[PDB]
């Protein structure tokens, strides 16, 4: 299991996103997060990315502490895990497969060596035929599913995504949730984030909220 300790970050405008926050990561688990109506839970996420410097606080990301930002170690660890924006970064001008192969270029593995896993993903989401122009004229959720797979690429150690299915229809949202469910069916420590929890209510899993910058507004519903 991993863990984290009380942490806060003033925005440069002083707008301290969190007073403090600590959390123990049960290795391989799944947690759905939703909080205040307008809280910088998005900022909470960017912080989870450590996209900014750690500011105030302590956290031990498994075998690595977030402190001592070694900018060199960034891609050395920016490859460690994967994410998905709620506004999915769909890459145009590439075939669906081509756009799906973006991580591969970073890897530098043999192209045929890549193609196997590449098809493996398309099967993993069972995805094919989203819309008319491969990447371009796809089906949104199917395009979203494609982004999901893009994340699924590289067999990342841990997953993450914020407000996934943010634009989805309720049935589509449920489908995405089940996709994530299967993702956890792969024994993956995968987190989640949400503006609301109406569906996440059905998600019988631990959920947490922060009192608008406080360490927490709620405990995990274990």
């Amino acid at each position: 299991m991993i863990r984290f300790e009380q942490v806060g970050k003033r925005y440069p405008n002083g707008h301290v996103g969190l007073h403090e926050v600590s959390f123990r990561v049960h290795r391989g688990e799944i947690l759905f997060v939703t909080g205040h109506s307008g809280a910088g839970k998005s900022t909470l996420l960017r912080l989870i990315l450590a996209m900014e410097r750690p500011t105030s606080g302590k956290l031990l990301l498994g075998g690595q502490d977030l402190g001592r930002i070694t900018t060199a170690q960034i891609p050395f660890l920016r490859r460690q895990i994967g994410v998905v924006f709620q506004n999915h970064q769909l890459l145009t001008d590439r075939t669906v497969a081509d756009n799906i192969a973006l991580p591969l270029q970073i890897l530098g593995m043999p192209k045929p060596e890549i193609a196997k896993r590449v098809a493996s993903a398309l099967e993993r989401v069972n995805l094919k035929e989203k819309g008319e122009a491969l990447p371009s004229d796809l089906s949104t959720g199917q395009q979203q599913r494609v982004g999901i797979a893009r994340a699924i690429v590289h067999q990342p150690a841990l997953l993450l995504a914020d407000e996934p299915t943010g634009n989805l229809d309720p049935r589509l949202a449920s489908e995405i949730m089940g996709v994530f469910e299967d993702i956890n069916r792969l024994g993956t420590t995968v987190l989640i984030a949400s503006h609301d929890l109406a569906l996440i209510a059905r998600m019988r899993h631990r959920m947490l909220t922060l009192q608008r910058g406080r360490i927490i507004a709620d405990r995990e519903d274990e």
Partner: protein, 181 residues
Amino acid sequence: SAYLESHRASLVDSLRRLFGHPFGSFFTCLVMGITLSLPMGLSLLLNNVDLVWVERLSAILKLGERFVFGLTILLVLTLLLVVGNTIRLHIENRRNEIEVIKLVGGTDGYVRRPFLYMGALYGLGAGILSWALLAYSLNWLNGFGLQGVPLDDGLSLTVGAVLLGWVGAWLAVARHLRELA
């Protein structure tokens, strides 16, 4: 090693981009050559290298020693300027993709090579065009002979063509990356 393959694919993509904008790139390589033509055309004019002025002509050489000694630098500055402008323009495109790469976590070299090879090559090509275009017009002028075809100078004719490409790329990359920074 692997970096060799990295540069190789970088060149491959750069060549695609050369074929990229093939009509725009047509005028662009035309611009590269044309900038060189102005730059080379000024760069070499050492020709001799009213007979009452024959004796006085001795100091004319000293006078001319600095006559265009700095004009070369001036053209060099202009060359750096055009290189940076073009590089940034290309660099400006595909910014979102660059972010995505960085979003995945990128390699500084991964960014650099696709551009550094992209620019040094354009520079080298223009400078090569210069070496021939020199005597191309020189002969038409002729009607010492009117054709350079020098050896060490012929070599150096394209040496800067690539050196400037690399340097201007370093400059533009620093600006754009610090902008990312």
